[PDB]
């Protein structure tokens with residue numbers, strides 16, 4: 001059984017559509033693992049028990065998930081209202097946001113915007129930013145974001161996972177540099 005497939009479904013439950021799987025989240029995003037298990041089994045994940053859900057969280061390379069006795073939440077990525085307490089640590093001076101080349105004109109006009117999610121997501125990993133952009137297209141641009149530019153105008157940059165940070169919005173003036181990574185047809 002591929003952890004990655006169960007993880008993609010679990011993330012959708014914990015970020016976007018918990019009710020579709022019989023789950024109610026707390027205001028801090030916490031689901032009862034027992035409810036997640038039942039909803040998955042009803043959707044055809046006939047082998048899944050608490051052990052497997054807990055394992056998805058423990059083995060996740062990014063720290064997408066958090067566990068405590070009986071419960072699991074996503075640390076970030078939500079489109080439904082939750083308040084997730086940040087992890088300790090200060091943000092680095094530069095963070096990355098991966099996107100597509102086609103989005104650059106509107107990002108330069110309106111800033112990096114949260115879209116359907118509660119926050120803009122930034123990473124300390126250039127390679128992760130590239131993979132994030134590649135979810136949307138083959139011609140990717142990575143924006144280098146000046147974190148002190150965000151902070152000094154009152155935009156808190158919160159650590160959600162070891163490498164993933166959230167902010168309400170990134171003003172275009174805080175984009176320090178644009179790096180391109182391209183796939184597919186050579187230009």
Ligand SMILES: Nc1ncnc2c1ncn2[C@@H]1O[C@H](COP(=O)(O)OP(=O)(O)OC[C@H]2O[C@H](OP(=O)(O)O)[C@H](O)[C@@H]2O)[C@@H](O)[C@H]1O
Pocket residue numbers: 011064077098099100103106107108110111112113114115116117121131132133136164
């Ligand atoms: N002004 C503007 N005009 C036009 N387009 C604009 C724009 N501002 C931003 N955009 C783009 O609008 C898209 C929104 O798309 P999304 O909501 O999926 O955001 P995202 O791609 O950051 O991804 C979130 C996390 O979700 C995944 O995490 P996981 O692996 O699932 O854990 C990822 O890796 C991340 O961490 C992105 O292309 C933005 O650049």
Ligand SMILES: [K+]
Pocket residue numbers: 086087088089090157158159160
């Ligand atoms: K923080």
